[PDB]
């Protein structure tokens, strides 16, 4: 299992800033065996990343259309991402489920578009504070996972991001991460059988250089989906160190 | 003023295809007197267009975030579009009002982000079949316009696209396009005074080489927002001929 350090810039960096960032990462990047990096950027930054990122650092999108092509003004397809050199894409991020009303079935459809076009979808699931306060975070997140992976093949990454951990500074405990990661792997076995052992399950939500080692060190956590700490190369370099 | 031939590819063309299209257009394009072109593309195609479009052809986006920057996964900002070379952007397209639940107030916010970053917003308005059959197309479209231009400066383009004309083949008559353009201009004078006379008002919805001249020749129509006919260079060249 390759540990995966996925870097979600969200809506940050112009193409000019993406090029400088990737130039800076290039000067400072030393591969860690066992660890893949992926930079998930705004779609118009992908050209800069393809030109300026180091060899083995993958890059990808933050969303993708549910449709193959057509009269969907403002949407960007899996064929387009792929052609730009993307190898992965985030689907069903909490910010899109909330702000853009993406349903589980929409997420499944988006993941299926990714897979039809040679992209690795990173499928996000996770509960809100109210669900967590009820103690129902596992069964709700697994229900959300079944919906979101309906028709989705085994070439997928699952990212558990509790919504109360996103942008709040309230990182999940490593124990809480492993709780969901373990339950997620059980569900993946039901759906995918033996392939489940190879499916990467990430943790995301206020991940930082100082907490990432302990979270990813747990048995069923295979890496991280990183928000704010992805924006500065030194932070990236620290997180990478923690996973070496 | 200048007739504007605004070409909305919607969700079509990979960066490779965009490049090929701009190259073909470069070899075949002969400017028409008083006709400006703008190409409205998927955001990851902008780089291809910047490098390969011929002289005097603007390019721009199909949507823009209501926010400046931050934790909005999958969204693209006005500052990003500007940095990529965009000089304009579609906001409030019917497909986004319908598929992405964009309100008038959201469109107005998007338009303001555009203007704050040196982009010309193209604000779309237009009624559905139901409203048209009640004969209330003018008052409802003008109510939509007021809301979508709330706090928007006079450096704006208004595109009237009746929803029943989009992708259906059912082009408005030139007379019906002028009815809305003339009413829209009356509202623009209330909001913007003398500046209203220079605000470009476009018709869109099933525009073709065969119908574009009679529409664009109307007193208050200053160009077209073109969907399907924008995808093949030969169709662009025929629309251009019709405006010569
Ligand atoms: Ca582990
Ligand atoms: Ca994230
Ligand atoms: Ca259009």
Swiss-Prot record, chains A, B:
Top-rank taxon: Bacteria
Enzyme Commission number(s) of this protein: 5.3.1.1
Single GO BP term: glycolytic process
Pathway: Carbohydrate biosynthesis; gluconeogenesis; Carbohydrate degradation; glycolysis; D-glyceraldehyde 3-phosphate from glycerone phosphate: step 1/1
Biological role: Involved in the gluconeogenesis. Catalyzes stereospecifically the conversion of dihydroxyacetone phosphate (DHAP) to D-glyceraldehyde-3-phosphate (G3P).
GO MF annotations in UniProt: triose-phosphate isomerase activity
Amino-acid positions noted as binding substrate in the UniProt annotation, renumbered to this chain: 8-10, 167, 206, 227-228
InterPro entries: Aldolase_TIM, TIM_sf, TrioseP_Isoase_bac/euk, Triosephosphate_isomerase, Triosephosphate_isomerase_AS
Organism this protein belongs to: Deinococcus radiodurans (strain ATCC 13939 / DSM 20539 / JCM 16871 / CCUG 27074 / LMG 4051 / NBRC 15346 / NCIMB 9279 / VKM B-1422 / R1)
Location in the cell: Cytoplasm
Oligomeric form and interacting partners: Homodimer.
Residue ranges the record marks as coiled coil: none
Annotated active site: 93 (electrophile), 161 (proton acceptor)
Identification of the protein by name: Triosephosphate isomerase
UniProt key word Cytoplasm: yes
SUPFAM superfamilies linked to this entry: Triosephosphate isomerase (TIM) (SSF51351)
UniProt similarity note: Belongs to the triosephosphate isomerase family.
Pfam families listed in its UniProt record: TIM
NCBIfam families membership: tim
GO-annotated cellular components: cytosol
Catalytic activity: D-glyceraldehyde 3-phosphate = dihydroxyacetone phosphate
Chief place of localization: cytoplasm
């Amino acid at each position: 299992m390759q540990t995966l350090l996925a870097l979600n810039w969200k809506m940050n960096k112009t193409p000019t800033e993406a090029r400088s960032w990737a130039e800076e990462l290039t000067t400072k990047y030393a591969p860690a065996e066992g660890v893949d990096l992926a930079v998930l950027a705004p779609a118009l930054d992908l050209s800069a990343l393809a030109a300026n990122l180091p060899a083995g650092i993958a890059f990808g999108g933050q969303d993708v259309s549910a449709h193959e092509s057509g009269a969907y003004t403002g949407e960007i397809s899996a064929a387009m991402l792929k052609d730009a050199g993307a190898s992965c894409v985030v689907v069903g991020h909490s910010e899109r489920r909330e702000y853009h009303d993406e349903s589980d079935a929409t997420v499944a459809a988006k993941a299926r578009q990714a897979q039809a076009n040679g992209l690795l979808p990173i499928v996000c699931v996770g509960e809100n504070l109210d669900v967590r306060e009820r103690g129902e975070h596992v069964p709700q997140t697994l229900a959300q996972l079944r919906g979101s992976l309906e028709g989705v093949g085994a070439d997928v990454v699952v990212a558990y991001e509790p919504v109360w951990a996103i942008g709040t500074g309230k990182t999940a405990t490593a124990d809480d991460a492993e709780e969901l990661a373990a339950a997620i792997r059980g569900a993946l076995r039901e759906q995918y059988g033996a392939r489940a052992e190879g499916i990467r399950v990430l943790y995301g939500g206020s991940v930082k250089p100082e907490n990432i080692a302990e979270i990813c060190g747990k048995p069923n956590v295979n890496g991280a989906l990183v928000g704010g700490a992805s924006l500065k190369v030194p932070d990236v370099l620290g997180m990478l160190d923690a996973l070496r």
